[PDB]
Amino acid sequence: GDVLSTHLDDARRQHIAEKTGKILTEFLQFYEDQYGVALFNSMRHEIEGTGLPQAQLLWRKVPLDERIVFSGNLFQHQEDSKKWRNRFSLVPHNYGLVLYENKAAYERQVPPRAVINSAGYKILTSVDQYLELIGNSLPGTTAKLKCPTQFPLILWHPYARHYYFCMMTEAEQDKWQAVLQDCIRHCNNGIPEDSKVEGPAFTDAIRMYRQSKELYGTWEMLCGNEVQILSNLVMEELGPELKAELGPRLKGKPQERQRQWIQISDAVYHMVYEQAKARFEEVLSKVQQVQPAMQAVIRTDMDQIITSKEHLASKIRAFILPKAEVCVRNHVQPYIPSILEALMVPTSQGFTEVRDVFFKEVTDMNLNVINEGGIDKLGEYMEKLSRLAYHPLKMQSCYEKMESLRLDGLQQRFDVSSTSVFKQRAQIHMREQMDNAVYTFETLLHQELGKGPTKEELCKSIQRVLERVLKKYDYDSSSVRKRFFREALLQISIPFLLKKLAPTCKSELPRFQELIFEDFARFILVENTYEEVVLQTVMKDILQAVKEAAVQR
């Protein structure tokens, strides 16, 4: 039989589901523990009024009207037939990649042949690059795919299936590379950053689970929505032993064996995804049911919870602060300036490029008003400007500023994962700030225009509204960048410290549990309090490094 029927038979699928279920159970215990802590922290910020200050730019409240992002014909390699077929390929408003047999089939409202969420994917523009990337997916390879055009585009994922496209011209290749890069970035941004409770509870639980498996530091596969990330977590853990078991059973030449493993991995990824979805959504519903009860206890007992948290922290400080401060002084503090410099330069270039692109587009609109000498086509020009933050070409020069980013870890070595994650996060911030700029410009211009078509010439109020939005932009850009640099420095330095401190602490921390009043245990965790103690040991150096640099400008 075929590869999947042979190697993923019912018995093997049951074993995989059992192992997956054990991982999900352990993760969900971390998640339920984290949930009340995330709730307490968010409520403390709101009640004490210590959340993020209000931005100067306005934020769009309703999404833009849904429009197709891009479409065109592509060739796609077909896994079943091994034949290349034309496909009409469409990117909807939500940045899925949708493939139809042809455009005529699309017009007749025929179902799509595939709908692809590209979270966790990477783009390759040559077959050799792709073969190099998968070349060591099975062991011992060095211990002794052919495209109809010269312009391929390949989508690779560590666990899910790979897609093979090609285009007729370098121009089409370049366009689809930008669009698919936008798709990946959009799908990776699957948990809203301003989620108050669910987001932080989930991502902290992921980190704590990984730490319990002795995995510290930024994780490249913390991308996509919750179920995708959980699927990545399971595949990371189960992949090695599944590969060790099935690898020797695969028959053929090295690249054929590599392709069979990709097919097996995708099938397991699907099975894991559905199992994780069911298990996670069950627990999410359970925590949401008791969240109001938790809110009442937090609101009533706020001051006593803070007191209990501070008492626990004081005992942890007494235990770990000497060794922590030495480790920061000797092994973190010397390197904070260099890491900050590496992050600041491309990030600040990118935010400045957003400003320049915004300024040019508003001026181009202003030129149109002067040329028609009138207000009457403003709605047409504002509609195009309203979408600038999602323009598949015009934003590319901003995003490109991040590709020179190279970050060392605290072993003074290039950190691939930190670099990847922080380029993605920086680019998402750039998209947000561009959208805020054009939304603010539109809103303020409409206000200004209530004065009348020519109380003074329209191009004077346009340029005055533009100058007002630019000052709001410059303020918000510095706010956003300072927060981003602080967050990134913390996310590089704290996992390093926790790993160095683990032989001292991991056996000893449970002894502090007895200090937590049982009715507060959903809101206070020994581990989280300990991690906050460690965080405070780098806070001075980080705030001062971002201060002394004044990197936020």
Residue numbers in the entry: 2 to 145, 152 to 560
Give the published text:
FAM129B (family with sequence similarity 129, member B), also known as MINERVA (melanoma invasion by ERK), is a member of a small family of proteins that includes FAM129A and FAM129C, which are present only in vertebrates. Following the first identification of MINERVA as a target of ERK phosphorylation, several studies have reported that MINERVA is upregulated in many types of cancer, including breast, kidney, large intestine, lung and endometrial cancers as well as hematopoietic and central nervous system tumors. Overall, MINERVA modulates crosstalk among essential cellular signaling pathways for cell proliferation, invasion, and apoptosis. Sequence and secondary structure analyses of 746 amino acid-long MINERVA protein indicate a PH domain on the N-terminus (residues Asp66–Gly197) and a proline-rich region on the C-terminus (residues Asp575–Phe746) which contains the phosphorylatable serine residues.
Here, we report the first crystal structure of MINERVA lacking the C-terminal flexible region, which contains the PH domain and a helix bundle domain with a novel fold. The trypsin digestion greatly aided production of large single crystals of MINERVAΔC suitable for data collection, and hence was implemented for crystallizations of the native and SeMet-substituted MINERVAΔC. Using the SeMet-substituted structure as a molecular replacement (MR) model, we could successfully resolve the native MINERVAΔC structure for residues Gly2–Lys145 and Leu152–Arg560 at higher resolution. The structure of MINERVAΔC could be divided into two domains, the PH domain (residues Ile69–Asn196) and a helix bundle domain comprising the rest of the molecule, which exhibits a distorted L-shape where the PH domain is held at the corner of the helix bundle. The overall architecture of the helix bundle domain resembles no other known structure, as analyzed by Dali structural similarity search algorithm, suggesting that it is of a novel fold. The N-terminal PH domain is tightly held by the helix bundle domain that acts as a pincer-like scaffold, with a large contact area of 1573.4 Å2. The N-terminal PH domain adopts a typical fold of a PH domain containing a central curved antiparallel β-sheet (β5↑-β6↓-β7↑-β1↓-β2↑-β3↓-β4↑) followed by a C-terminal α-helix, α5. The spatial arrangement of the two domains allows the N-terminus of the protein to be located adjacent to the PH domain in proximity, presumably for cooperative action of myristoylated Gly2 residue and the PH domain for membrane localization of MINERVA. Surface representation of the protein reveals that MINERVA possesses a positively charged patch on its membrane-interacting face, which is mainly composed of positively charged residues Lys83, Lys84, Arg86, Lys104, Arg109, Arg114, Lys145, and Lys153 of the PH domain and Arg256, Lys258, and Lys260 of the helix bundle domain, presumably enabling stable interactions of MINERVA with the plasma membrane (top view).
